[PDB]
Design a protein around this ligand. Structure first.
Ligand SMILES: [Ca+2]
Length: 129
């Protein structure tokens, strides 16, 4: 719920949205109305190999809960993913920081890992001086 996120998602185009559109399909695996609830949200996040807290499941949605329905949609999730990208970069943040690049392999598959390994590099120093 910040400008840094809304500003990022705003830049995203159909090309990028398309990738997310397919993700939701798997993310809502089991859901009745193809929605992302806390029940599944916890399995999808833990599927990557994490053991976060139960409260986080709700807090995560609360952040993107505008309609106050209690579920994350394609539009809501759009903002969530934006935060993910700016979650690992921060560094030092609890023992579970979901990432858009990491979660990808979860939906796309294991091949996604071998396909791209940019995360491994991790570098960003302009060095002005
Ligand atoms: Ca909702």
């Amino acid at each position: 719920g910040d400008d840094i996120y809304k500003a990022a998602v705003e830049q995203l185009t159909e090309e990028q949205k398309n990738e997310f559109k397919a993700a939701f399909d798997i993310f809502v695996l089991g859901a009745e109305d193809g929605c992302i609830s806390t029940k599944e949200l916890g399995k999808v996040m833990r599927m990557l190999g994490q053991n976060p807290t139960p409260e986080e499941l709700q807090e995560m949605i609360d952040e993107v809960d505008e309609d106050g329905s209690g579920t994350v949609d394609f539009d809501e999730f759009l903002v969530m993913m934006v935060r993910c990208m700016k979650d690992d970069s921060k560094g030092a943040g609890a023992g579970v920081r979901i990432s858009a690049d990491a979660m990808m392999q979860a939906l796309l598959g294991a091949r996604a890992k071998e396909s791209l390994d940019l995360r491994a590099h991790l570098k960003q120093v302009k060095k002005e001086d």
